[PDB]
Structure formats: structure tokens, C-alpha cells
């Protein structure tokens, strides 16, 4: 049961569940186009999705929820979760986005794709912020799990409302884990709440990026730029954009 775990138990749990870093199909014998560019990233996303589904299932408390609730949370959060992974990996490559170790893109490479440079720019900004806050592996995994349990939560007769209490209780633990990590690192109590607020305020900005990238992908789809896996298609149809 997720609720009786200590903080070091909670952090190990999240550290061992971490997904792998995947490689892109990249074909540098091929040039680049909006289309090849986008084929490469949506292939990557699709594979990254499968792992996510499995990473999610090892998130303490997540399997406690009903499948409808689990489907729903993932439906809400999948692109943020991919975006925070990305920004995390790019942390140490300033001005580039490490989509995959064999797909490391700068913003001029963004140009290829209509609508992307806006989004790319956001993604770099956030990476910078992470790097300036010296965000830690241990803090990242918590932030990621907060995104999975929170982003869908507000969009939920009786069991319905007792799954809410439950997500909220698990999210109350991850906050505890966050602070305890910050105590362990020797931040003052005032610095504990200040940092805590800053990492959380960034989640608001990641949601804005997911909403834009979702719209962006949807244009791509509606413009027949790249074929989408039925899974990505379903994820996309979740958010009924127009």
C-alpha cells in the first residue's frame, strides 16, 4: 500500500520503475523534411508510450485505481510526461533537445516543421530552468509521478469520489517525499517551501506546453503530414481538439 511507505522507500520505488531511454530510428543517410522529422519523433513517442504505460503501473497507488480511472489519467497526462522526460534529458545539453541519444536537435532543426519552433522554444526554456534550479534525479521522478496523478484528477457515483480521496492521499505522500529530500539535502525550512513551490509552478508551465503540442500534433495529423500509430491516434482523440 502506497500510503505506509517511507520517503526513501517511496524514492527507490520511483527510481526502479523509471523507463529506459530509447533510441530513434534516425537515418542520417536521409536528409530532413517536416515529414521525416515528424515521422522520427512520432515513432519515438509511440515507443516511449508503451514503456510509460508500464512505468505508470509501478507508480505506487496507481494500480489501486480502477482501469477507467487509469486510462483516463494517462489519456490526460501522456504528453506532459513525455515532455518532462525530454526536458530532463536535455538538461545537460544547453540549446538542444535530446529526443534520443541519436536524435539531438537544436532549434534551427525545429524550422523544418511548421508550428514547432514555438514549442521547441518553450521546451528549451524549461530545460534551462531545471538546470538553473539544479533539479535532481530524485526530484524529477516525484515531479513526474505528480503529473500522472494530478493532471487527470479534476476531470472525474460513490466509488467515483473515493478514488479522488485516494489520489489526493498518494499526492500528499509525494509532497512529503519532496520535502524530506530537500531536508536531507540541507535546505532551510523556508528554502524547503520556496523550492517546493517553484518545482510545482513549473508543472503549470509544462501543462501549457502539452496543450500546445497536442494542438500542434493535431494540425500535423489533419494535414496528413505523418502517419500516426493507432495508439497515438487514440491518445490524440482523447483531447477532442478541433
Amino acid at each position: 500500500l502506497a500510503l505506509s511507505l517511507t520517503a526513501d522507500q517511496m524514492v527507490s520505488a520511483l527510481l526502479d520503475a523509471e523507463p529506459p531511454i530509447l533510441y530513434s530510428e534516425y537515418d542520417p543517410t536521409r536528409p530532413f523534411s517536416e515529414a521525416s522529422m515528424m515521422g522520427l519523433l512520432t515513432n519515438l513517442a509511440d515507443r516511449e508510450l508503451v514503456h510509460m504505460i508500464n512505468w505508470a503501473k509501478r507508480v505506487p497507488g496507481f494500480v489501486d485505481l480502477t482501469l477507467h480511472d487509469q486510462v483516463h489519467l494517462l489519456e490526460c497526462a501522456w504528453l506532459e510526461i513525455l515532455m518532462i522526460g525530454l526536458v530532463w534529458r536535455s538538461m545537460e545539453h544547453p540549446g538542444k533537445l535530446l529526443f534520443a541519444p541519436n536524435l539531438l536537435l537544436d532549434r534551427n532543426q525545429g524550422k523544418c516543421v511548421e508550428g514547432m519552433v514555438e514549442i521547441f522554444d518553450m521546451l528549451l526554456a524549461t530545460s534551462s530552468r531545471f538546470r538553473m534550479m539544479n533539479l535532481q534525479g530524485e526530484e524529477f521522478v516525484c515531479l513526474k509521478s505528480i503529473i500522472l496523478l494530478n493532471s487527470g484528477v479534476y476531470t472525474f457515483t460513490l466509488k467515483s469520489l473515493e478514488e479522488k480521496d485516494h489520489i489526493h492521499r498518494v499526492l500528499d505522500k509525494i509532497t512529503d517525499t519532496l520535502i524530506h529530500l530537500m531536508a536531507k539535502a540541507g535546505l532551510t525550512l523556508q528554502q524547503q517551501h520556496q523550492r517546493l513551490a517553484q518545482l510545482l509552478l513549473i508543472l503549470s508551465h509544462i501543462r501549457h506546453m502539452s496543450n500546445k503540442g497536442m494542438e500542434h500534433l493535431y494540425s500535423m495529423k489533419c494535414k496528413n503530414v505523418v502517419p500516426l500509430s493507432d495508439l497515438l491516434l487514440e491518445m490524440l482523440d482523447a483531447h477532442r481538439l478541433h
Binding site: 508503451v50 504505460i53 503501473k57 482501469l67 487509469q70 486510462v71 494517462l74 489519456e75 493507432d230 495508439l231 487514440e234 491518445m235
Partner: peptide, 11 residues
């Protein structure tokens, strides 16, 4: 409707 997310959340 057999959704793929649905399905994979069982495997």
C-alpha cells in the same frame, strides 16, 4: 470499444 490503452493496461 476495444481501445489500445485499455488493452495494454492489462499486459
Amino acid at each position: 470499444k476495444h481501445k489500445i490503452l485499455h488493452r495494454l493496461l492489462q499486459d
